[PDB]
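Replying to the earlier thread about multi-chain prediction with a worked example.

Input:
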Amino acid sequence: SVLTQPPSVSVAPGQTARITCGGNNIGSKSVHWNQQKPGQAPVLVVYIPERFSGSNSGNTATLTISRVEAGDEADYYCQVWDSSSDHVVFGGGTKLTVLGQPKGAPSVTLFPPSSEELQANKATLVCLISDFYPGAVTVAWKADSSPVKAGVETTTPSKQSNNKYAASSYLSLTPEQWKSHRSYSCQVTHEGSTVEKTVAPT
Amino acid sequence: QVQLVQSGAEVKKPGASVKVSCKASGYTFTDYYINWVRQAPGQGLEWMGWIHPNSGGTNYAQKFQGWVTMTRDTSISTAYMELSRLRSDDTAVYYCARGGLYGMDVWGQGTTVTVSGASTKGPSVFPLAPSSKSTSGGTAALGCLVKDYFPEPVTVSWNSGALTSGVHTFPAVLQSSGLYSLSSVVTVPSSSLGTQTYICNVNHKPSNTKVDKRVEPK
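Result:
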């Protein structure tokens, strides 16, 4: 048995979310639903509020969440028991995103290499991006308006404690590379708008 | 209180083996199946198998047959699972969910198994000096670069835990060399520099290293 779910579903606060789970005659095989918030273990629902209700019929099972809150942002997995093998089969999982959170522009702080690191014949540019929503960012680096992509390491966006997102981008280069250019720039774009910070060896 | 408590994180090399235990509490260990599930970083849930603690019999998914071994010790109400000849793919979080004798209720907190060819390495801590550009409207931004360490995690405090407001420590980047790097910045009033001392305390227990770097202005 295979279990197919929509990969993502989005809903406004207070609205009703519906997450489907498709399978071969799933309407007669007893379906269970799991909820997993980021960083935690899965938690069984299968109906924790009465806003969660289940409905299994035909070839699709459906978890319905009424009056959605931001606390409901999680990953949801359906789960059935393949009696052909005495195995447990999980669904692909659905990402529930709530569309009520306030948008935010990225705040960027760029640090030149330390003198101590330069004395070790090393040099790193540190670009710290914070307080942006939604959590999607593109980072670009420039050496005197010439794009640079070697030595670039960037983190994927990670949600902060204030329910916004943060990332960081690092540019690895040599001291003779750092002092050979007039300046370097870390450009961060987010929903069309861009913020740029420049740093120079002087 | 029904609980499932698993062993701590493990950092292994390719070709090595690992054993993870699952402790059962708040219920008779031997009238509920014990299932195991693997979740790769950013992927979904993948059932690995079950074992019933009464007779000790097992049932594995085909993908995990041959290198996964599930046992149990009914005396201490503990289930075990042994991964043999580890691969980089096997890097994942491993859970030990409880199953009905029809429940499939209650999960463990999970054990992280990180498989990599990188070797344990303490970090080089460099200060991120304030000065201009770091200052914006009377507030200065000083940081600490914690470069080239393996494996996770590091802990960064400021002034031995006395400086907590304005602290933003960033999740670590995994460079292509296999080592980690993160940064920890604090926003302090620009008038505080000169009269106040700022030290970042970086603790990296896997390497038994702790570095207090004084961050001074340019």
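The CA atoms of residues 189 and 195 of chain B lie 11 Å apart.

Feel free to reuse this layout for your own posts.
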